[PDB]
Amino acid sequence: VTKLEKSIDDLEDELYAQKLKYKAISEELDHALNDMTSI
Amino acid sequence: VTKLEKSIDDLEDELYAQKLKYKAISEELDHALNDMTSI
Amino acid sequence: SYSSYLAKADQKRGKKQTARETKKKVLAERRKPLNIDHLNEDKLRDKAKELWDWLYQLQTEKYDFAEQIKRKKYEIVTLRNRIDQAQKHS
Amino acid sequence: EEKKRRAATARRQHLKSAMLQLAVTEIEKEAAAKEVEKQNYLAEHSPPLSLPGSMQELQELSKKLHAKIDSVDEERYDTEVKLQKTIKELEDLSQKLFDLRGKFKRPPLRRVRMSADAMLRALLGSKHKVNMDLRANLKQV
Amino acid sequence: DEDETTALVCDNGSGLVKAGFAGDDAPRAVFPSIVGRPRHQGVMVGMGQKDSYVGDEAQSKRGILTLKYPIEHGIITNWDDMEKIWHHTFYNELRVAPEEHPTLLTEAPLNPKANREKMTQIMFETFNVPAMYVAIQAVLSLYASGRTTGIVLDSGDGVTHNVPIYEGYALPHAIMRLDLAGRDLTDYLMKILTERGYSFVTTAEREIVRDIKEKLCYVALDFENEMATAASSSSLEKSYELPDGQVITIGNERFRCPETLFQPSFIGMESAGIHETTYNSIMKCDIDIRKDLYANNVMSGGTTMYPGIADRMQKEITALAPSTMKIKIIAPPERKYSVWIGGSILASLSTFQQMWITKQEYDEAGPSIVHR
Amino acid sequence: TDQQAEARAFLSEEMIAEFKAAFDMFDADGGGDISTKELGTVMRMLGQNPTKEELDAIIEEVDEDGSGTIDFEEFLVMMVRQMKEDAKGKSEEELANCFRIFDKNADGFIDIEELGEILRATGEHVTEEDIEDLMKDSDKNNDGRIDFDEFLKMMEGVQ
């Protein structure tokens, strides 16, 4: 159990890192699709 | 342990789903930043 | 884009499992056991048909809901053509 | 200076009306025929029931039906849901068009209240004689 | 369609009005929230004597009129001049007759009960609209980002706010207002740019400092070693060409202007800044709801558009929040219209019909009816 | 009152005559206007079950004098708007249907082929020139087909 709990916390943390690294590129995106439809 | 092993497999699977759902929006991105620098 | 994979599982499984029980809850209500077993002999007669009608009842509705989707499916096809036609990015 | 051109247009109209006129009469044909298909389908999937003997049969049949009921009912349900799904899909499409055009003709959902002709009939019963549609009325002869 | 097409959405701001039809994706009408009154008697060629001017004609002709702002810090301060901006919106900007259109309006965070009743009195009794509805601004911004619980940092032209919302109900006692926004921010750039050795002398020099702020300003993360970077003098500099040739250069000040939002001390303000205020709102709320608010910091408003605002805020509150917490700063691209878009969605919605205050409700219940 | 004008201008004595008889039954006491309650009674007789909110909205739709009640004038207005909407719905429905009949191939369009067929299918005598002519006049987006929108337009008027 301590081994698997240690591997769940590393994947769940590698995670909010991935899930967040995105809100940034998908939002940089609605933006970087809106200015060329405007320019 | 069976509870935490079950929660590790759901987070690790929710995962390759997130990690992949991205390669697509980050790649749609180099593209959708290149055409407005061009127009 | 693979961090969104965990979203697929959670999402799909979620919604699908939600839908299931609902269907079960719903369908269960509309169900009254065949309790009447060996209480009379001519009862079966006045009973059997009632079940028969209920079946025919449902059957007929299923047929209508069916033809309906078809008609709607066509409303869509057209409603889609109006969407493209009404594109003209000009 | 295209003085005759006027007759050309009238033709299209004459034809357009020949078309609609054609439509309507074809519309009810398909309609009834459609129904015919409906009674045939039902004709075999649930034919004029014939109550069996007395003992095991009535009971058996009853059990037979009752089980089919849960069956057909489930199907009926799945269908209703695929409808829901569909109506949904077109409502969204019935949007993707609004905010791209505005209010457009023939919305798929159509929010309709009862007609005035209905209310009139409903309330006066017998004495409701006016085939109202649009035709205004101005002194005859 | 009767009203599917027909619902109007008017978002009244301190600097701009945003207006249009529920259904549209963005405001059909955007214009200054001014009402100009001519200082002298006379006419333009071909026009008659005009008693008043609104929006852009008031801005363009500002040299002969006394300009007035009806909304001070998000609250309507002059009701004679506001009815003038509404009139202009319906009749000239959207060119609709109001007496056949339901109207969704917006108000500010702790808008006095009496005002929500007064604009209802004016909507129904002087414009004769069929039905209307007043939504709170942060609440429409949140909802336009899909959700129902979160905390909105809302920042426009005269006010900044933090409005914690839980399952739709904005939390009165946790809302914070900071009176420093984009207006304050253009005037500070002005001085750090004249202070760079310049002159915004004519009115065609004044106005464009604001277009410099919008186009070239940044919110740097690690604003510390960004000044340090400025000094080594990298290709961080940025020259803008004025109405004429007069190429003005802005290297550094470019980010010294939005660092004002984190440090109000740059402008002789003693109040706390945006990130601390996000946080304080949050340690004023119930305990059990604080993980929700932290993962849902929605940003809206013209002044939250400075690039890198979200990254700075991200790191600003991570480092104040308990590490057991998930921080998440949502900043959408259309954010200068979040409020409006949230209203467009809501008012075109299938379920909203039953919350419209109708003239039937009003003529029967008094302004109290819509006040809630 | 301006509405109550064209409204009464629209209807005929016949109309008014009946709409009155109808209005009278709405009005219990016989005072002169339907109240938020007098309406509720008739609605249920008509097979509905409105709520206080719903009723008022239905009332203040034609209440120009902010009375909170409806007079035989505000009423005629109401009947008119309805008369209108009814006729519009019936029209678009019919045309909608006609389009499906003419379409049959279900591609959501009506190509010169089908147009010919349906046309030739009428009793009328027509030569290809007529058919292609009607196509050219109807097809505004010059794409060859006739979309529902265009079909609505082209049939605009025709009966």
Short mmCIF file of N, CA and C in Angstrom, two decimals, chain F residues 19-120:
data_model
loop_
_atom_site.label_atom_id
_atom_site.label_comp_id
_atom_site.label_asym_id
_atom_site.label_seq_id
_atom_site.Cartn_x
_atom_site.Cartn_y
_atom_site.Cartn_z
N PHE F 19 -65.36 37.53 -31.77
CA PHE F 19 -64.35 37.80 -30.77
C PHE F 19 -64.95 38.48 -29.56
N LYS F 20 -66.09 39.13 -29.77
CA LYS F 20 -66.78 39.80 -28.68
C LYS F 20 -67.45 38.73 -27.84
N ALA F 21 -68.34 37.98 -28.48
CA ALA F 21 -69.04 36.89 -27.82
C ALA F 21 -68.04 36.12 -26.99
N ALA F 22 -66.87 35.90 -27.58
CA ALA F 22 -65.81 35.17 -26.91
C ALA F 22 -65.28 35.94 -25.73
N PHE F 23 -65.08 37.23 -25.93
CA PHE F 23 -64.56 38.08 -24.88
C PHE F 23 -65.55 38.10 -23.72
N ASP F 24 -66.82 38.27 -24.04
CA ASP F 24 -67.81 38.30 -22.99
C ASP F 24 -67.69 37.11 -22.07
N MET F 25 -67.54 35.90 -22.61
CA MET F 25 -67.45 34.74 -21.73
C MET F 25 -66.19 34.80 -20.90
N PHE F 26 -65.15 35.43 -21.42
CA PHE F 26 -63.94 35.52 -20.62
C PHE F 26 -64.29 36.32 -19.38
N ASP F 27 -64.91 37.48 -19.61
CA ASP F 27 -65.33 38.42 -18.57
C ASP F 27 -66.54 37.96 -17.75
N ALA F 28 -66.27 37.45 -16.55
CA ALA F 28 -67.29 36.95 -15.64
C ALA F 28 -68.33 38.01 -15.28
N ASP F 29 -67.95 38.83 -14.30
CA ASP F 29 -68.75 39.94 -13.77
C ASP F 29 -69.42 40.77 -14.86
N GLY F 30 -68.80 40.80 -16.04
CA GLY F 30 -69.36 41.56 -17.15
C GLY F 30 -68.98 43.02 -17.08
N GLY F 31 -68.00 43.31 -16.22
CA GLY F 31 -67.53 44.67 -16.03
C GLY F 31 -67.01 45.31 -17.31
N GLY F 32 -65.96 44.75 -17.88
CA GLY F 32 -65.44 45.33 -19.10
C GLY F 32 -64.04 44.87 -19.39
N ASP F 33 -63.50 44.03 -18.53
CA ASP F 33 -62.16 43.53 -18.76
C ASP F 33 -61.84 42.25 -18.00
N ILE F 34 -61.01 41.43 -18.63
CA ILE F 34 -60.59 40.16 -18.08
C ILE F 34 -59.56 40.41 -17.00
N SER F 35 -59.74 39.83 -15.82
CA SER F 35 -58.78 40.01 -14.74
C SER F 35 -57.82 38.85 -14.69
N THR F 36 -56.81 38.97 -13.84
CA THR F 36 -55.83 37.90 -13.72
C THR F 36 -56.54 36.61 -13.26
N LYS F 37 -57.75 36.73 -12.72
CA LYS F 37 -58.47 35.54 -12.27
C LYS F 37 -59.50 35.11 -13.33
N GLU F 38 -60.23 36.06 -13.88
CA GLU F 38 -61.21 35.73 -14.89
C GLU F 38 -60.50 34.97 -16.00
N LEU F 39 -59.25 35.34 -16.28
CA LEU F 39 -58.51 34.66 -17.33
C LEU F 39 -58.23 33.22 -16.92
N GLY F 40 -57.68 33.05 -15.72
CA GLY F 40 -57.37 31.71 -15.21
C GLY F 40 -58.49 30.70 -15.39
N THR F 41 -59.72 31.11 -15.09
CA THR F 41 -60.88 30.23 -15.24
C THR F 41 -61.03 29.74 -16.68
N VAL F 42 -61.06 30.66 -17.63
CA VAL F 42 -61.20 30.28 -19.02
C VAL F 42 -60.03 29.39 -19.48
N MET F 43 -58.81 29.72 -19.06
CA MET F 43 -57.65 28.95 -19.47
C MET F 43 -57.82 27.49 -19.15
N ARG F 44 -58.30 27.22 -17.94
CA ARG F 44 -58.52 25.85 -17.51
C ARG F 44 -59.64 25.20 -18.31
N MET F 45 -60.68 25.96 -18.62
CA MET F 45 -61.77 25.44 -19.43
C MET F 45 -61.18 25.08 -20.78
N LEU F 46 -60.13 25.81 -21.16
CA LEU F 46 -59.46 25.60 -22.43
C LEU F 46 -58.40 24.53 -22.30
N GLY F 47 -58.29 23.98 -21.11
CA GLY F 47 -57.35 22.92 -20.94
C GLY F 47 -55.94 23.27 -20.60
N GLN F 48 -55.74 24.34 -19.86
CA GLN F 48 -54.39 24.68 -19.45
C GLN F 48 -54.39 24.76 -17.96
N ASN F 49 -53.25 25.17 -17.43
CA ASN F 49 -53.10 25.33 -16.00
C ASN F 49 -51.98 26.31 -15.75
N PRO F 50 -52.19 27.57 -16.12
CA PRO F 50 -51.18 28.60 -15.93
C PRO F 50 -50.92 28.97 -14.48
N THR F 51 -49.76 29.58 -14.24
CA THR F 51 -49.35 30.03 -12.91
C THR F 51 -49.44 31.55 -12.85
N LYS F 52 -49.57 32.10 -11.65
CA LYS F 52 -49.68 33.55 -11.51
C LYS F 52 -48.74 34.29 -12.43
N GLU F 53 -47.47 33.90 -12.45
CA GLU F 53 -46.52 34.56 -13.31
C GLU F 53 -47.00 34.47 -14.74
N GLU F 54 -47.17 33.23 -15.20
CA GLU F 54 -47.61 32.97 -16.57
C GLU F 54 -48.83 33.78 -16.99
N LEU F 55 -49.83 33.83 -16.12
CA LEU F 55 -51.05 34.57 -16.43
C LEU F 55 -50.78 36.03 -16.71
N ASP F 56 -50.10 36.70 -15.78
CA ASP F 56 -49.83 38.12 -15.95
C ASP F 56 -49.11 38.44 -17.21
N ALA F 57 -48.05 37.69 -17.46
CA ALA F 57 -47.26 37.87 -18.67
C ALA F 57 -48.22 37.85 -19.86
N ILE F 58 -49.14 36.90 -19.84
CA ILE F 58 -50.13 36.77 -20.90
C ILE F 58 -51.06 37.97 -20.91
N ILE F 59 -51.22 38.59 -19.75
CA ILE F 59 -52.10 39.74 -19.64
C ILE F 59 -51.40 40.99 -20.11
N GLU F 60 -50.31 41.34 -19.43
CA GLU F 60 -49.59 42.54 -19.79
C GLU F 60 -48.93 42.50 -21.16
N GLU F 61 -49.33 41.55 -22.00
CA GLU F 61 -48.80 41.46 -23.35
C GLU F 61 -49.55 42.46 -24.22
N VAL F 62 -50.81 42.71 -23.89
CA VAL F 62 -51.63 43.66 -24.64
C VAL F 62 -52.24 44.73 -23.75
N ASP F 63 -51.73 44.86 -22.52
CA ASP F 63 -52.24 45.87 -21.57
C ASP F 63 -51.46 47.15 -21.75
N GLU F 64 -51.97 48.00 -22.63
CA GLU F 64 -51.36 49.27 -22.95
C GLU F 64 -51.65 50.33 -21.89
N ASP F 65 -52.75 50.16 -21.16
CA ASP F 65 -53.12 51.12 -20.13
C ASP F 65 -52.66 50.69 -18.75
N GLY F 66 -51.64 49.83 -18.71
CA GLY F 66 -51.11 49.33 -17.44
C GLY F 66 -52.16 48.97 -16.40
N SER F 67 -53.36 48.61 -16.87
CA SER F 67 -54.51 48.26 -16.02
C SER F 67 -54.37 46.94 -15.28
N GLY F 68 -53.67 45.99 -15.88
CA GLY F 68 -53.52 44.69 -15.26
C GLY F 68 -54.75 43.88 -15.62
N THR F 69 -55.45 44.33 -16.64
CA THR F 69 -56.64 43.65 -17.09
C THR F 69 -56.69 43.84 -18.60
N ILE F 70 -57.59 43.13 -19.27
CA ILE F 70 -57.70 43.22 -20.72
C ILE F 70 -59.12 43.64 -21.12
N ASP F 71 -59.22 44.67 -21.95
CA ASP F 71 -60.51 45.18 -22.47
C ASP F 71 -60.72 44.65 -23.89
N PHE F 72 -61.97 44.67 -24.37
CA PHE F 72 -62.27 44.15 -25.71
C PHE F 72 -61.39 44.71 -26.82
N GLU F 73 -60.63 45.74 -26.50
CA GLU F 73 -59.76 46.35 -27.47
C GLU F 73 -58.42 45.63 -27.38
N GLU F 74 -57.81 45.68 -26.20
CA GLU F 74 -56.53 45.02 -25.96
C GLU F 74 -56.66 43.56 -26.40
N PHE F 75 -57.86 43.03 -26.23
CA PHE F 75 -58.18 41.66 -26.61
C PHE F 75 -58.06 41.48 -28.12
N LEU F 76 -58.79 42.29 -28.89
CA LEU F 76 -58.71 42.19 -30.35
C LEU F 76 -57.28 42.25 -30.82
N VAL F 77 -56.47 43.06 -30.15
CA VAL F 77 -55.08 43.17 -30.52
C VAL F 77 -54.50 41.78 -30.39
N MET F 78 -54.65 41.23 -29.19
CA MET F 78 -54.16 39.89 -28.89
C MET F 78 -54.62 38.84 -29.91
N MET F 79 -55.91 38.83 -30.24
CA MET F 79 -56.44 37.87 -31.20
C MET F 79 -55.70 38.07 -32.50
N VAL F 80 -55.55 39.32 -32.91
CA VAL F 80 -54.84 39.59 -34.15
C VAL F 80 -53.44 38.97 -34.14
N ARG F 81 -52.56 39.38 -33.23
CA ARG F 81 -51.21 38.81 -33.19
C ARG F 81 -51.30 37.29 -33.36
N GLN F 82 -52.25 36.68 -32.67
CA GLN F 82 -52.40 35.25 -32.77
C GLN F 82 -52.80 34.88 -34.18
N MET F 83 -53.92 35.39 -34.64
CA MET F 83 -54.35 35.11 -35.99
C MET F 83 -53.11 35.08 -36.89
N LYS F 84 -52.28 36.12 -36.78
CA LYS F 84 -51.05 36.24 -37.57
C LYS F 84 -50.18 35.03 -37.40
N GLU F 85 -49.60 34.90 -36.21
CA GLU F 85 -48.74 33.76 -35.90
C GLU F 85 -49.31 32.42 -36.37
N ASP F 86 -50.61 32.21 -36.18
CA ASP F 86 -51.21 30.94 -36.60
C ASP F 86 -50.93 30.74 -38.08
N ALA F 87 -51.48 31.64 -38.89
CA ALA F 87 -51.32 31.61 -40.35
C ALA F 87 -49.87 31.47 -40.83
N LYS F 88 -48.95 32.08 -40.10
CA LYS F 88 -47.54 31.99 -40.46
C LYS F 88 -47.08 30.55 -40.25
N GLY F 89 -47.34 30.02 -39.06
CA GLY F 89 -46.94 28.65 -38.77
C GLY F 89 -47.47 27.66 -39.79
N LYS F 90 -48.77 27.73 -40.09
CA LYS F 90 -49.42 26.83 -41.05
C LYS F 90 -48.76 26.92 -42.41
N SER F 91 -48.37 28.13 -42.78
CA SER F 91 -47.75 28.32 -44.07
C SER F 91 -46.41 27.61 -44.14
N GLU F 92 -45.48 28.02 -43.29
CA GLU F 92 -44.14 27.44 -43.25
C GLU F 92 -44.17 25.92 -43.09
N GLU F 93 -45.16 25.41 -42.39
CA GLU F 93 -45.28 23.97 -42.20
C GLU F 93 -45.56 23.35 -43.55
N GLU F 94 -46.60 23.84 -44.22
CA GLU F 94 -46.95 23.33 -45.53
C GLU F 94 -45.76 23.37 -46.49
N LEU F 95 -45.14 24.54 -46.62
CA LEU F 95 -44.00 24.65 -47.50
C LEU F 95 -42.91 23.67 -47.09
N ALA F 96 -42.66 23.60 -45.79
CA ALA F 96 -41.64 22.71 -45.28
C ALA F 96 -41.88 21.32 -45.83
N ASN F 97 -43.14 20.90 -45.74
CA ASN F 97 -43.55 19.60 -46.21
C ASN F 97 -43.35 19.46 -47.69
N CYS F 98 -43.74 20.50 -48.42
CA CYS F 98 -43.59 20.47 -49.86
C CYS F 98 -42.17 20.28 -50.26
N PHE F 99 -41.27 20.85 -49.48
CA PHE F 99 -39.88 20.72 -49.81
C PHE F 99 -39.44 19.28 -49.66
N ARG F 100 -39.98 18.58 -48.69
CA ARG F 100 -39.56 17.20 -48.47
C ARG F 100 -40.08 16.32 -49.58
N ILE F 101 -41.22 16.68 -50.11
CA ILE F 101 -41.82 15.91 -51.18
C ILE F 101 -41.06 16.08 -52.47
N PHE F 102 -40.67 17.32 -52.71
CA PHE F 102 -39.93 17.69 -53.89
C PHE F 102 -38.49 17.21 -53.79
N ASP F 103 -37.98 17.13 -52.57
CA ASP F 103 -36.62 16.69 -52.37
C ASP F 103 -36.45 15.23 -52.71
N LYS F 104 -37.07 14.36 -51.91
CA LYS F 104 -37.00 12.92 -52.14
C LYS F 104 -35.76 12.56 -52.93
N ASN F 105 -34.76 12.24 -52.13
CA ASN F 105 -33.42 11.84 -52.48
C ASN F 105 -32.79 12.33 -51.17
N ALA F 106 -33.58 13.09 -50.42
CA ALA F 106 -33.22 13.63 -49.12
C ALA F 106 -31.85 14.29 -49.00
N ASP F 107 -31.34 14.89 -50.07
CA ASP F 107 -30.05 15.53 -49.96
C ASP F 107 -30.21 16.94 -49.38
N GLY F 108 -31.45 17.30 -49.02
CA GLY F 108 -31.72 18.61 -48.45
C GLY F 108 -31.82 19.73 -49.48
N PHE F 109 -31.72 19.33 -50.74
CA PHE F 109 -31.76 20.24 -51.87
C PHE F 109 -32.80 19.79 -52.87
N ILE F 110 -32.93 20.58 -53.92
CA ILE F 110 -33.83 20.28 -55.00
C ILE F 110 -33.02 20.60 -56.26
N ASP F 111 -32.48 19.59 -56.92
CA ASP F 111 -31.69 19.85 -58.12
C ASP F 111 -32.54 19.94 -59.38
N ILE F 112 -32.03 20.64 -60.39
CA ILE F 112 -32.74 20.81 -61.65
C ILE F 112 -33.44 19.52 -62.11
N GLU F 113 -32.89 18.37 -61.74
CA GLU F 113 -33.52 17.12 -62.16
C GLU F 113 -34.89 16.99 -61.50
N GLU F 114 -34.89 16.92 -60.17
CA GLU F 114 -36.11 16.80 -59.36
C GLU F 114 -37.09 17.92 -59.70
N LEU F 115 -36.57 19.13 -59.89
CA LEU F 115 -37.42 20.26 -60.21
C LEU F 115 -38.14 19.93 -61.48
N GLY F 116 -37.42 19.35 -62.43
CA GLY F 116 -38.06 19.02 -63.69
C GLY F 116 -39.13 18.01 -63.40
N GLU F 117 -38.72 16.89 -62.82
CA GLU F 117 -39.67 15.85 -62.50
C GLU F 117 -40.92 16.42 -61.90
N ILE F 118 -40.82 16.93 -60.69
CA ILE F 118 -41.98 17.49 -60.01
C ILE F 118 -42.78 18.40 -60.93
N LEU F 119 -42.11 19.23 -61.69
CA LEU F 119 -42.81 20.12 -62.59
C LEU F 119 -43.56 19.34 -63.66
N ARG F 120 -42.82 18.50 -64.35
CA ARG F 120 -43.36 17.68 -65.39
C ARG F 120 -44.46 16.82 -64.75
#
